[PDB]
Design an enzyme around this catalytic site. Structure first.
Site, PDB file in Angstrom:
ATOM      1  CD  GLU A 166      -3.397   1.132   2.287  1.00 46.99           C
ATOM      2  OE1 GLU A 166      -2.149   0.212   2.720  1.00 46.99           O
ATOM      3  OE2 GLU A 166      -3.613   1.583   2.198  1.00 46.99           O
ATOM      4  CG  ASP A 167      -0.688   4.029  -1.028  1.00 45.56           C
ATOM      5  OD1 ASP A 167      -0.741   3.875  -1.781  1.00 45.56           O
ATOM      6  OD2 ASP A 167      -1.708   4.814   0.027  1.00 45.56           O
ATOM      7  CB  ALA A 168       5.497   1.093   0.403  1.00 39.72           C
ATOM      8  CG  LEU A 169       6.679   5.529  -3.865  1.00 38.62           C
ATOM      9  CD1 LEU A 169       5.182   5.780  -3.369  1.00 38.62           C
ATOM     10  CD2 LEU A 169       7.648   6.821  -4.263  1.00 38.62           C
ATOM     11  NE  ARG A 187      -4.955   6.777  -3.038  1.00 35.55           N
ATOM     12  CZ  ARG A 187      -4.392   5.470  -2.555  1.00 35.55           C
ATOM     13  NH1 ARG A 187      -4.036   5.196  -3.320  1.00 35.55           N
ATOM     14  NH2 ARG A 187      -4.319   5.628  -1.337  1.00 35.55           N
TER      15      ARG A 187
END
Ligand SMILES: [Zn+2]
Ligand SMILES: [Zn+2]
Ligand SMILES: [Zn+2]
Ligand SMILES: [Zn+2]
Lengths: 67, 216, 46, 48, 1114
Positions: free
Chosen positions: E733-736, E917
């Protein structure tokens, strides 16, 4: 501030070309990529930083200590 | 101050490194404390007149832009003479003036009595006399000493033009101290010899100014 | 240069005593920096 | 109930005032300089 | 190349902004102040006399700033940037001429100085005003600071534009139960004053005015308004037949059942029921005691002499309220801007100032008083230089004000808070970002649903993107690019000018009136309601765009309410755009060649009648198209450009129109927090916390707005090569996830310039504070605890400096704290030293230190540290598109793909980020970028426009990549073809605040607060954390006792109390102290918080005497 020595991906030496690039842009009105085309960057990753990286350091030198 | 419960070490070093903040002597290895506690987030005969004292003082004080500091310093002097009851039978202006004046004199800052006295009707023998008297009743002695080197700066700020003046300032100073050396410095007003040197170096500065503008 | 500090506008080298003066010599300007040492320092490039 | 202490509701109006221990409401310390921070209870009752 | 309607319109907004600056809203106000205001404001009070000395006066004449009458522009003043280092206030002295009386034959003027005015950057009186690139350099300050802010005490603050509820016009709002509160609240100079009106109950309607007593039957007042009709009275507010007939009449009934003929009765019914004259000048106690205040109670608005104006005004108020009092809706709500008129900075400064200077003069009377008390000899001596001693409460007090953020108005006794802010420099964007922000206020408590919705009328006149969640005591909004806020113009010319159109005086009118046509209103004040509204409006609006009263002084009509409105009111939002001439525009498409030629300027359209400023109500009348492509002869106006809709910040969003607004919100709110160039002045300024970026870069794609604010010249961010894939299942989740030996090659690298300041303050002990140090034992070396400084004993330039050590040594005397006497011998030599340690989780360097002094002549050292943070794991990279994300695991090099040119996807993001999203602008933008690097161009794609997509494909296919961004790649680990093609290509990412390395915080045993001796609060001071109610109650549902007994007992406050069975209380050691005892005590454990609770209680009168029991034995 300075041309980064290498691009963040390729890691080909970038620094050399910034000077000569700007030379080829000022004299010899010519298209950007086409310049870099014969300037030796055939892969975009490197190329961005020549297309990118506004040169600040002179705009700083305005404020140099001795003026 | 205290000493170790065992090693009898008197030298206490407080380690803030790990954010324990624990004080221990390098002689034992035992802290003498845990988790040091820290902070967080007018009816009188004299004191009402003291609120008046700072009030009038603080008011008239920085009209000259004298240091907020030095004013505070002089207030306690007004309390000093207040103890001696020097403050009883004389015009409050002459008092409050002298109070401030002894400070700046003691701190040797650039102002002059004749300069400072002017904010009223003062004949300057008035205040000078007062200040002289509180000296008679105060054993304060040698501190109020003077030289023009103070004054000349504050003068130059009124002299306009450019910054050659500053160069000229260094001119006058060597002049000034030489006039102090040539023994004519004594027995005359610092303002006079001050504006004297200021002129002489302005004449050295090949400018056209006036004695009027000087005594100004 | 080698000596203690520099002006702001003048960029004029100056040294000072203690409780002495805030002004430099040549500048009617006040603030001043502090020159960098001759003392060796170290970084590691990585 | 009137066992002893409550000795009848003559307690409920203040004839004497318990003063809070210092440890409860300290005057904030002098913290670098002569500025000494008050505390309201101390001030209010100390006017009382 | 001939000029093209498709191309031409674009050159306007820049040319518009080319002259008139980005922020005039803090400028032209402040400028207007230093000419208009003070020249009038003193012209209010030019003369003062104490009550004494029949012949005396003090006569003000001149107000200026920075001219003693020597040269025009101020000859010299301290440089602002330099001042930013000295912690002064950057200001100009006031010069004032006062000709006045002192003694026989004087009446002499001089030039006088009341004090200094805290000026503002890039004003009329600024130094930088008209400064080209040189006075910049020599004056050591960057050209690109937008200005429009103050600086005091060396810190930097801004007046935030305060949105205020629009003032002095009737607002009437329907409400459930009640009876529909109506109000008009009027303020002119003296006495801002409010009067509500409303029904009391069931048609029975009365005046509330906090001045008046209360509850007055209105139509009775309408008689007292001097109209005796009792017929038209109904007939005026009522209507003709329809409905209204009956509705109001009940009033007349109860109005009739009491009295009549106001001339005494009613009038002195008001003078009879009213607050008293407040003692003096109750000589007016009369029947006409009220007749004076009959004019002045509610409205300063009109007054005059006979009442028919004011009367019929009040009647008109009654009209609208009985109108929708008939039926709901049909009421004004506070939503649309027209009922909210913000007022810019300049006006606020006068309102504040004039009352400061007010108190000044008032007490200056008291000053000259003590002169004229005791007439010893002849006292004149002007008592002028006593203005010095009495001065600067105006000046220094004003400093304290603007720095505070709280304004005290002693004229109105009205106090507003949070009026200013610290300018936010995290970027270049942040600077102008919090500038052009809008605070709200009032709106009673929060739960009213009014301060919620974002309305349609908000189009183009407020940013449609950022309205962040910082609601709290207000509501934050933003201006668009093009918003002019029109100041007040003037009244009388438009008044008698409307008469020049031939409009009729109220006095000439038929009584029964409102039946005929609609109405005319000046600022909400009717005159004639002239016949023939349309051609009227046409001519008028024409006259504006043609001959007179340009900008505002607009006109808008209404049907439902029969009226038309023209206002001169100030503080209004205005937007430009193009009037259509018949079926098409007025420019005729050739006139922009007549623009780009270089001789046009701007407002030339205005003065030559092409385009002009507009208004909500105004544009609510007019009819505007989007593009010249769609135009109808039935139209009225047309926008210049669509992309003026979003504001400054929001302009950064590429292709906003392809993304859901929820994203543009967070993206604007974060964008201001990015890190980057700041300004050219950078390394010569010193900040408390100022970030930067090591290698800034232009965002590969441009939104036309960026070129407008000169943004890209100050880039904040990195132009990054990015792939979208699931690689290294840390992604989630959203972690680059990043590339080493990239960040190693350099990337994202940061520096943080912080500062520390120390004020060396002298002491009335006549003893300064000493900076000495560097003990250097053994001769071996300055002790490692200290070391590091230099021969001066102060931090050295450019040295690795580490926690536990000292970069600056400050020491004060121990006797310095106490009361000195002039009795001394030798030793001041006692010095308590408190050298400030640099704490921190890592190494640091000192590249600048400053020994300097402020106005007050006391030594001062303000220094700064810098440490280059490597953009290591945990940091927050964003998308500039609305992706808020944290770098996850960092991968070395070999892994993650390479493909044909072996390019490494430096930042590898997540697929599931986009679709659910749902933001496509980032995605398409990628294609735009990989295009840009080809033909070698910065590339548009600006809002609603710029670069089309369909072309870019052909732009790639020739160079032989997919017409999507998709491509093959090869396993960074396993080294073979990936199963699914991957969309990727260069994009632009940036690094925010919330560096992990600041926020990681832990406490083993930290300090305890003086009071509760627990875990001192927050981070900073020291650690310890917060387990609150809602969280705590959780651990109940697991039934865990011992987690509590550890948690809120042992490790919160571990504490024993000595207690006594007999007469249970809390003693200590050996006593119950109510009973001399030394016996019954039981040593035991309780939360020290709990003891605190008891002693508090028992410090008040109450006793929870305890009962005890055996823990064992059943
Ligand atoms: Zn490359
Ligand atoms: Zn010990
Ligand atoms: Zn200098
Ligand atoms: Zn007991």
């Amino acid at each position: 501030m300075i041309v980064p020595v290498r691009c963040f991906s390729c890691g080909k030496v970038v620094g050399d070309k910034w000077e000569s690039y700007l030379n080829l842009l000022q004299e010899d009105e010519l298209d950007e990529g086409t310049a870099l085309s014969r300037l030796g960057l055939k892969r975009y990753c490197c190329r961005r930083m020549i297309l990118t990286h506004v040169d600040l350091i002179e705009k700083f030198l305005r404020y140099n200590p001795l003026e | 101050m205290p000493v170790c419960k065992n090693c009898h070490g008197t030298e206490f070093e407080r380690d803030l490194s790990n954010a324990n903040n624990d004080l221990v002597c390098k002689a034992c290895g035992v802290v003498s404390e845990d988790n040091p506690i820290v902070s967080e987030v007018a009816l009188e005969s004299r004191e009402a007149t003291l609120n008046n004292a700072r009030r009038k003082l603080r008011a008239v004080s920085y009209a000259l832009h004298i240091p907020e500091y030095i004013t505070d310093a002089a207030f306690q002097w007004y309390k000093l003479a207040l103890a001696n009851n020097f403050v009883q039978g004389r015009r409050s202006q002459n008092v409050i003036a002298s109070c401030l004046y002894v400070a700046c004199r003691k701190e040797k800052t650039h102002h002059m009595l004749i300069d400072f006295s002017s904010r009223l009707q003062v004949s300057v023998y008035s205040i000078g006399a007062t200040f002289l008297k509180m000296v008679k009743k105060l054993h304060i002695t040698e501190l109020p000493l003077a030289d023009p080197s103070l004054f000349i700066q504050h003068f130059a700020e009124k002299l306009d033009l450019a910054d050659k003046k500053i160069k000229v300032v260094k001119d006058a100073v060597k002049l000034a101290q030489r006039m102090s050396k040539d023994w004519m410095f004594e027995g005359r007003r610092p303002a006079g010899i001050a504006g004297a040197c200021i002129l002489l170096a302005c004449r050295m500065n090949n400018l056209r100014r006036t004695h009027t503008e000087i005594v100004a | 240069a080698t000596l203690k500090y520099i002006c702001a506008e003048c960029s004029s080298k100056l040294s000072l005593s203690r409780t002495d003066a805030v002004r430099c010599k040549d500048c009617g300007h006040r603030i001043l920096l502090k020159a960098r040492t001759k003392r060796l320092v170290q970084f590691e490039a990585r | 109930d009137a066992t002893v202490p409550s000795g009848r509701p003559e307690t409920y109006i203040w004839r004497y005032l318990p003063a809070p221990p210092v440890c409860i409401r300290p005057s904030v310390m002098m913290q670098d300089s002569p500025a000494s921070n008050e505390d309201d209870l101390t001030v209010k009752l100390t006017e009382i | 190349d001939e000029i093209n309607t498709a191309q031409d319109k674009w050159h306007l907004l820049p040319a518009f902004l080319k002259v008139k600056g980005l922020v005039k809203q803090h400028l032209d106000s402040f400028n207007y102040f230093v000419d208009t205001d003070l020249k009038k404001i003193i012209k209010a009070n030019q003369l003062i006399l104490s009550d004494v000395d029949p012949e005396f006066y003090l006569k003000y004449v001149d107000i200026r700033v920075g001219k003693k009458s020597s040269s025009s522009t101020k000859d010299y003043l301290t440089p602002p940037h330099e001042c930013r280092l000295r912690d002064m206030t950057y200001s100009a002295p006031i010069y004032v001429d006062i000709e006045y009386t002192r003694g026989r034959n004087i009446i002499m003027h001089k030039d006088v100085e009341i004090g200094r005015m805290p000026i503002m950057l890039r004003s009329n009186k600024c130094i930088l005003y008209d400064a080209d690139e040189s006075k910049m350099a020599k004056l050591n300050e960057c050209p690109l600071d937008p200005g429009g802010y103050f600086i005091v005490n060396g810190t930097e603050k801004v007046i935030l534009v305060q949105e205020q509820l629009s003032k002095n016009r009737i607002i009437v709002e329907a409400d459930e139960k009640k009876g529909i509160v109506q109000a008009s609240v009027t303020s002119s100079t003296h006495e801002r004053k409010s009067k509500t009106y409303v029904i009391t109950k069931n048609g029975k309607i009365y005046l509330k005015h906090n001045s008046i007593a209360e509850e007055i039957p209105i139509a009775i007042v309408l008689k007292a308004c001097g109209i005796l009709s009792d017929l038209e009275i109904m007939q005026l507010v009522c209507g003709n037949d329809s409905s209204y007939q009956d509705i109001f009449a009940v009033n007349l009934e109860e109005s009739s059942k009491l009295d009549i003929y106001t001339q005494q009765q009613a009038l002195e019914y008001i003078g009879a029921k009213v607050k008293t004259m407040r003692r003096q000048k109750l000589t007016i106690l009369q029947e006409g005691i009220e007749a004076i205040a009959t004019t002045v109670i509610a409205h300063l608005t009109v007054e005059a002499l006979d009442f028919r104006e004011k009367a019929l005004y009040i009647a008109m108020m009654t009209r609208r309220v009985v109108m929708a009092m008939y039926n709901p809706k049909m009421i004004d709500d506070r939503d649309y801007v027209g009922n909210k008129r913000l007022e810019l900075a300049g006006q606020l400064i006068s309102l504040l100032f004039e009352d400061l200077f007010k108190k000044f003069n008032n007490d200056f009377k008291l000053s000259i008083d003590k002169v004229l008390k005791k007439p010893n000899r002849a006292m004149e001596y002007d008592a002028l230089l006593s203005i010095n001693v009495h001065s600067n409460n105006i000046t220094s007090g004003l400093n304290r004000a603007i720095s505070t953020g709280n304004w005290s108005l002693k004229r109105f006794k009205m106090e507003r808070a949070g009026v200013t802010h610290v300018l936010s420099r995290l970027s270049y964007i942040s600077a102008l970002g919090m500038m052009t922000r809008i605070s709200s206020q009032f709106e009673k408590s929060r739960k009213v649903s009014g301060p919620r919705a974002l309305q349609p009328s908000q189009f183009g006149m407020l940013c449609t993107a950022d309205t962040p969640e910082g609601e709290a005591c207000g509501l934050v909004k933003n201006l668009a690019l093009m918003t002019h806020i029109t100041t007040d113009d003037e009244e009388e010319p438009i008044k008698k000018l409307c008469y020049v159109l031939g409009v009729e005086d109220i006095t000439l009118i038929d009584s029964a009136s409102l039946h005929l046509n609609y109405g005319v209103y000046l600022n909400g004040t009717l005159i004639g309601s002239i016949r023939f509204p349309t051609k009227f409006v046409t001519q008028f609006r024409h006259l504006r765009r043609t001959g007179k009263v340009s900008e505002f002084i607009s006109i808008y009509s209404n049907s439902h309410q029969m009226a038309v409105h023209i206002a001169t009111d100030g503080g209004r939002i205005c937007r430009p755009l193009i009037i259509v001439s018949d079926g098409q525009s007025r420019v005729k498409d050739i006139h922009l060649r007549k623009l780009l030629d270089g001789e046009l300027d701007f407002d030339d359209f205005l003065k030559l009648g092409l385009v002009e400023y507009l208004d909500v109500n105004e544009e609510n009348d007019s009819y505007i198209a989007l593009y010249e492509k769609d135009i109808v002869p039935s139209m009225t106006h047309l926008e210049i450009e669509p992309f003026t809709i979003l504001g400054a910040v929001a302009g950064l969003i590429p292709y906003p129109h392809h993304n859901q607004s929820p994203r543009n919100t967070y993206q604007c709110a974060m964008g201001k927090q990015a890190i980057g160039a700041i300004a050219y002045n950078q390394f010569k300024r010193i900040d408390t916390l100022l970030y930067l970026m090591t290698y800034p870069q232009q965002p590969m794609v441009k939104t036309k707005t960026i070129e407008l604010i000169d943004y890209d010249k100050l880039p904040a961010g990195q132009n990054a090569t990015v792939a979208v894939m699931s690689y290294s299942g840390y992604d989630i989740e959203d972690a680059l996830v990043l590339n080493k030996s990239s960040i190693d090659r350099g990337f994202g690298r940061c520096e943080t310039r912080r500062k520390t300041t120390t004020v060396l303050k002298r002491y009335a002990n006549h003893t300064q504070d000493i900076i000495g140090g560097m003990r250097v034992d053994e001769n071996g070396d300055p002790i490692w605890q200290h070391q590091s400084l230099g021969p001066d004993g102060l931090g050295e330039v450019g040295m690795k400096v580490q926690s536990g050590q000292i970069y600056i040594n400050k020491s004060v005397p121990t006797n310095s704290a106490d009361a000195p006497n002039p009795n001394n011998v030798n030793v001041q030599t006692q010095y308590r030293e408190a050298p400030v340690i640099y704490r921190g989780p890592e190494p640091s360097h000192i590249d600048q230190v400053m020994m300097s002094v402020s106005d007050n002549d006391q030594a001062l050292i303000k220094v700064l540290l810098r440490q280059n943070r490597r953009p290591e794991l945990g940091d927050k990279f964003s998308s500039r598109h609305g992706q808020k994300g944290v770098c996850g695991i960092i991968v070395k090099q070999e892994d993650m793909p390479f493909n044909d040119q072996g390019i490494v996807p430096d930042i590898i993001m997540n697929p599931h980020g986009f679709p659910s999203r749902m933001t496509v602008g980032k995605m398409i933008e990628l294609i735009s970028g990989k295009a840009g690097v080809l033909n070698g161009t910065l590339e548009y794609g600006t809002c609603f426009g710029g670069s089309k997509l369909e072309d870019m494909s052909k732009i790639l296919v020739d160079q032989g990549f997919n017409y999507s961004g998709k491509d093959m790649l090869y396993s960074g680990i396993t080294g073979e073809c990936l199963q699914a093609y991957i969309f990727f290509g260069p994009i632009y990412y940036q690094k925010l605040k919330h560096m992990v390395l600041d926020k990681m915080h832990a406490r083993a045993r930290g300090p305890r607060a003086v009071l509760t001796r627990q875990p001192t609060e927050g981070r900073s001071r020291d650690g310890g954390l917060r387990l609150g109610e809602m969280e705590r109650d959780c651990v109940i549902a697991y039934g865990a006792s011992q987690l509590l007994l550890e948690r809120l007992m042992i490790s919160s406050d571990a504490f024993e109390v000595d207690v006594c069975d007999k007469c249970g209380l809390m003693g200590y050691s050996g006593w119950c102290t109510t009973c001399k005892s030394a016996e019954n005590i039981i040593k035991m454990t309780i939360p020290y918080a709990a003891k605190l609770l008891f002693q508090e209680l028992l410090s008040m009168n109450i006793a929870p005497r305890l009962r005890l029991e055996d823990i064992f034995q059943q």
